[PDB]
Design a protein around this ligand. Sequence first.
Ligand SMILES: [Cl-]
Ligand SMILES: [Cl-]
Ligand SMILES: [Cl-]
Length: 163
Amino acid sequence: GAMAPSYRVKRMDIAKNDEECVVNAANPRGLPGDGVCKAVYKKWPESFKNSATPVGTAKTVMCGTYPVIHAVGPNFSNYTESEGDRELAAAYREVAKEVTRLGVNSVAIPLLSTGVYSGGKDRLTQSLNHLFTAMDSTDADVVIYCRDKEWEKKISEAIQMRT
Ligand SMILES: [Cl-]
Ligand SMILES: [Cl-]
Ligand SMILES: [Cl-]
């Protein structure tokens, strides 16, 4: 575990993380995809060997000794708000199990279901709150990656609020 487990946010490409493992915002079929998934594919392509996994699950594949946790959030275009919310919570619970199993002291994590899977809605608070519920019982240092300047401020404020 980390000696004083923390949350931090950085506005940068998760492919440049300084953590012991990365969470991919994966599609269910293990395809290269877009956004975070495309950046992960370019950096750790070997981790996409048998990475296909259902919605609401996470599957880890090693790129050398570096763990890539493929976490599949729901596409809110296809799910009801209610069933989507359930699957988004589930995906983050499976990430917490994998982080614990791997025994890493740190993890880079994006906000699941906030880009092309958002169904055209702002899901910063919904996704961030499911991340906290899952990860609060882990002792890994958690570094959340984002690309939008205004999202960086809101994620930073939400982390500070609880401390
Ligand atoms: Cl960058
Ligand atoms: Cl997404
Ligand atoms: Cl963002």
